Amino acid sequence: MKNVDLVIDLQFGSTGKGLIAGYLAEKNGYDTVINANMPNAGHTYINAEGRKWMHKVLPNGIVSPNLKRVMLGAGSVFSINRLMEEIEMSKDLLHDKVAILIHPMATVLDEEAHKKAEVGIATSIGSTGQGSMAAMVEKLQRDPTNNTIVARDVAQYDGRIAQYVCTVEEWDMALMASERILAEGAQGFSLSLNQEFYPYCTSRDCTPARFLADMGIPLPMLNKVIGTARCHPIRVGGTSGGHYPDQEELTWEQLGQVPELTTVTKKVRRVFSFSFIQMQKAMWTCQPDEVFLNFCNYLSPMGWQDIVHQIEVAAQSRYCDAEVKYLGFGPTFNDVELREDVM
Amino acid sequence: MKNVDLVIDLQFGSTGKGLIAGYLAEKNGYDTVINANMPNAGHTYINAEGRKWMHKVLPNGIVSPNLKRVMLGAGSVFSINRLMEEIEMSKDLLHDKVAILIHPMATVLDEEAHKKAEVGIATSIGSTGQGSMAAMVEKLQRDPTNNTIVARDVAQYDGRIAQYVCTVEEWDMALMASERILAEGAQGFSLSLNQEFYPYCTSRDCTPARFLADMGIPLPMLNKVIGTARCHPIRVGGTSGGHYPDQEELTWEQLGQVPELTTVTKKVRRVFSFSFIQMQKAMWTCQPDEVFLNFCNYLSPMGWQDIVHQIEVAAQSRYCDAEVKYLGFGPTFNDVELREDVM
Numbered sequence: 021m022k023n024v025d026l027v028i029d030l031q032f033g034s035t036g037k038g039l040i041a042g043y044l045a046e047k048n049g050y051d052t053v054i055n056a057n058m059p060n061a062g063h064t065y066i067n068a069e070g071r072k073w074m075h076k077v078l079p080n081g082i083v084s085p086n087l088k089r090v091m092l093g094a095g096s097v098f099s100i101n102r103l104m105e106e107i108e109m110s111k112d113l114l115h116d117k118v119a120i121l122i123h124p125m126a127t128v129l130d131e132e133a134h135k136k137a138e139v140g141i142a143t144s145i146g147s148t149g150q151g152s153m154a155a156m157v158e159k160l161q162r163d164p165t166n167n168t169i170v171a172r173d174v175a176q177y178d179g180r181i182a183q184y185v186c187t188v189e190e191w192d193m194a195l196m197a198s199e200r201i202l203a204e205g206a207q208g209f210s211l212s213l214n215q216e217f218y219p220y221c222t223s224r225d226c227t228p229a230r231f232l233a234d235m236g237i238p239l240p241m242l243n244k245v246i247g248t249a250r251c252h253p254i255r256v257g258g259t260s261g262g263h264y265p266d267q268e269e270l271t272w273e274q275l276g277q278v279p280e281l282t283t284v285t286k287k288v289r290r291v292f293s294f295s296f297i298q299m300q301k302a303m304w305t306c307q308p309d310e311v312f313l314n315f316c317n318y319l320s321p322m323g324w325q326d327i328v329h330q331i332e333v334a335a336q337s338r339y340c341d342a343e344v345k346y347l348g349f350g351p352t353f354n355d356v357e358l359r360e361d362v363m
Numbered sequence: 364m365k366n367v368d369l370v371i372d373l374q375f376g377s378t379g380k381g382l383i384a385g386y387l388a389e390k391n392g393y394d395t396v397i398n399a400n401m402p403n404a405g406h407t408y409i410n411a412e413g414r415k416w417m418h419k420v421l422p423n424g425i426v427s428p429n430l431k432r433v434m435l436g437a438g439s440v441f442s443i444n445r446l447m448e449e450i451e452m453s454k455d456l457l458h459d460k461v462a463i464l465i466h467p468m469a470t471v472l473d474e475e476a477h478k479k480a481e482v483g484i485a486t487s488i489g490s491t492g493q494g495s496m497a498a499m500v501e502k503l504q505r506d507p508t509n510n511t512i513v514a515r516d517v518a519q520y521d522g523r524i525a526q527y528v529c530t531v532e533e534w535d536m537a538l539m540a541s542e543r544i545l546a547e548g549a550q551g552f553s554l555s556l557n558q559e560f561y562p563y564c565t566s567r568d569c570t571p572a573r574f575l576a577d578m579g580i581p582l583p584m585l586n587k588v589i590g591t592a593r594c595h596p597i598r599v600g601g602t603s604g605g606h607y608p609d610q611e612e613l614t615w616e617q618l619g620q621v622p623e624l625t626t627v628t629k630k631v632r633r634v635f636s637f638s639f640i641q642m643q644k645a646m647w648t649c650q651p652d653e654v655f656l657n658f659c660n661y662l663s664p665m666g667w668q669d670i671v672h673q674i675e676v677a678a679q680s681r682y683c684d685a686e687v688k689y690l691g692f693g694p695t696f697n698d699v700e701l702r703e704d705v706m
């Protein structure tokens with residue numbers, strides 16, 4: 021037990037979870053990396069040598085030097101095409117002594133039907149329109165005649181995932197056999213289905229409890245929660261929802277920064293000032309032990325040092341002993357500073 | 364912060380959670396009782412005086428002598444009619460100093476549309492066909508024009524719940540302000556969406572992680588998990604799913620018991636021998652601290668004493684220090700024995 025480090029987002033997503041996941045994977049050498057991603061979530065890790073991993077399926081933690089298991093949780097919604105591609109792109113890391121385990125109930129994304137089902141919400145709620153919820157809904161239908169939604173069933177006619185699809189027992193045994201686990205949450209605290217921005221939110225809760233549930237991680241296994249934040253939280257472009265009372269929407273030109281986009285759609289990310297309210301809210305339910313404060317490169321030292329003190333008191337106020345341990349000044353491994361080294 | 368006692372079911376549901384919830388509520392005097400029930404779950408508590416509470420919405424813990432808050436989680440799917448009936452039937456317990464808090468994102472069941480949507484699975488997967496998932500799916504749609512699915516929106520035109528529907532802040536504050544919390548899980552571990560019986564399962568995981576997530580309970584708030592089990596696990600009637608390799612389907616006549624009828628459908632419950640495999644599986648992910656072993660009245664002392672030893676070694680085998688603390692010999696408060704007193 022107590023061997024799971026879970027990376028969660030404290031804001032509305034895209035805080036740099038892919039970066040801290042890959043950074044911690046390299047630093048801590050987890051033998052097991054696990055997630056429960058849906059296609060709405062792209063995760064980028066760039067190592068010291070400049071190698072980039074943009075993952076929608078595989079954990080970014082596959083960069084761990086002691087990698088034995090790659091686990092794709094039951095809450096996973098994935099494109100097999102994308103998975104194939106991602107495995108291929110890191111086949112050097114995903115060697116013969118690395119077991120890729122797809123939970124039998126992980127959802128196979130029907131790229132045509134599921135993205136087409138989310139065209140409406142892609143404009144109405146600014147949804148990534150990636151088919152995440154449409155896939156999830158098809159799975160929830162629990163139609164016995166539907167052999168095309170869960171990994172277990174898809175493995176029977178689509179041999180590409182057949183070797184990866186495990187049983188629920190193998191799943192549990194893989195977690196039991198793991199020495200140190202990196203659990204990678206996706207999306208963001210405030211994007212949680214049950215946070216206050218409904219319906220301008222995602223299809224699930226983006227909370228440690230939900231991410232552990234979606235990866236089938238027993239609660240005693242949780243060792244550490246590394247919450248991630250940006251100095252200026254973002255939202256996706258469009259009518260993607262409101263913000264907290266203590267924050268204002270900013271422009272990329274107001275920040276003196278190049279407009280951040282959603283990589284494929286190129287929608288300009290919405291950017292907001294830091295929200296203390298959001299932080300207390302995220303601190304209260306996410307209860308991180310450690311905090312990665314990213315995009316410190318968008319602020320002056322006084323600015324990001326201030327947000328560090330804000331996060332830690334927002335933590336303390338919500339009975340959370342969160343320590344901003346990591347600071348991000350760029351998208352690569354080299355840009356992750358130990359907070360104690362820079363302040 | 365550890366003040367939440369979470370009641371979970373270790374088998375396929377109807378193990379007597381309602382009973383242990385009401386029993387522990389009376390014994391421990393929680394000021395806050397919380398759940399995230401869907402209409403597929405009916406929980407029965409009978410006190411020492413013979414008063415019965417068959418709850419589909421309200422926690423059974425409302426019988427707590429120190430009750431201050433009744434909380435209906437965001438994962439809740441409820442009929443307002445049923446909620447009103449249960450409030451009415453317990454209006455003496457739910458006085459002016461008792462705050463009923465319905466999470467703003469708790470789902471309001473559309474009895475006609477949602478039950479109609481689950482007619483197929485009510486026969487195909489033996490689903491309670493109560494509209495649980497159809498309500499959940501409507502909520503997941505996140506259509507901004509849909510003002511009729513979440514409690515927050517429904518409270519705006521349906522005044523019956525208006526006083527109960529809180530904000531996400533009030534929700535968090537109500538949990539923060541609570542001294543001792545009784546979290547009541549529903550359904551059963553093996554009914555979990557991501558357990559091996561898919562699609563013969565429920566619309567979510569019935570795991571502590573999912574239950575805490577669905578009630579918006581921060582993980583550090585978890586004090587203890589009371590797992591519940593029957594000596595002979597049941598399933599609902601019909602084509603409700605398989606069983607474990609170490610268990611066999613029995614008849615009520617084989618057990619010398621009057622045929623038990625499903626909470627929702629008047630259908631005869633399917634009954635199985637005790638499954639050690641099921642227990643290890645439930646012990647592994649549910650990780651109960653305490654176990655309530657119910658329906659001991661269906662076995663001889665040697666029989667239920669054996670299942671006690673089986674549960675505790677199934678626990679130990681899955682790194683779980685679960686202690687069968689409670690034994691059930693009937694449906695009332697008087698029938699809950701301390702295991703140390705009877706063996």
Ligand SMILES: Nc1ncnc2c1ncn2[C@@H]1O[C@H](COP(=O)(O)OP(=O)(O)OP(=O)(O)O)[C@@H](O)[C@H]1O
Binds near residue numbers: 032060062314350
């Ligand atoms: N400090 C930084 N400065 C500049 N760019 C950065 C920094 N940290 C990360 N990035 C980049 O900004 C984006 C952050 O999104 P990324 O997908 O890595 O985050 P995430 O938290 O994993 O997202 P998701 O919400 O999908 O879970 C990526 O394109 C990443 O390369």
Ligand SMILES: Nc1ncnc2c1ncn2[C@@H]1O[C@H](COP(=O)(O)OP(=O)(O)OP(=O)(O)O)[C@@H](O)[C@H]1O
Binds near residue numbers: 380404548657660694
């Ligand atoms: N030991 C017992 N002997 C006989 N009947 C009992 C016993 N314990 C509980 N019951 C009855 O068994 C039935 C099933 O229990 P109940 O509906 O409360 O289960 P539950 O575990 O709370 O439900 P669910 O699966 O919906 O979450 C009820 O009618 C209850 O009163």
Ligand SMILES: Nc1nc2c(ncn2[C@H]2C[C@H](O)[C@@H](COP(=O)(O)O)O2)c(=O)[nH]1
Binds near residue numbers: 034062145211222256
């Ligand atoms: N930045 C970011 N936004 C996301 C992610 N997942 C969901 N969202 C946001 C986009 C919208 O504001 C809202 C609805 O999106 P979707 O879950 O794709 O239906 O949630 C994610 O991983 N990152």
Ligand SMILES: Nc1nc2c(ncn2[C@H]2C[C@H](O)[C@@H](COP(=O)(O)O)O2)c(=O)[nH]1
Binds near residue numbers: 376496
């Ligand atoms: N005994 C019992 N069965 C349930 C409960 N919730 C769901 N189920 C079972 C009935 C079916 O076998 C299956 C699917 O049901 P449903 O969740 O109602 O769609 O799960 C519950 O609380 N108790």
Ligand SMILES: [Cl-]
Binds near residue numbers: 391
């Ligand atoms: Cl107790």
Ligand SMILES: [Mg+2]
Binds near residue numbers: 033034035061062063
């Ligand atoms: Mg991103």
Ligand SMILES: [Mg+2]
Binds near residue numbers: 376377405626
């Ligand atoms: Mg029941």
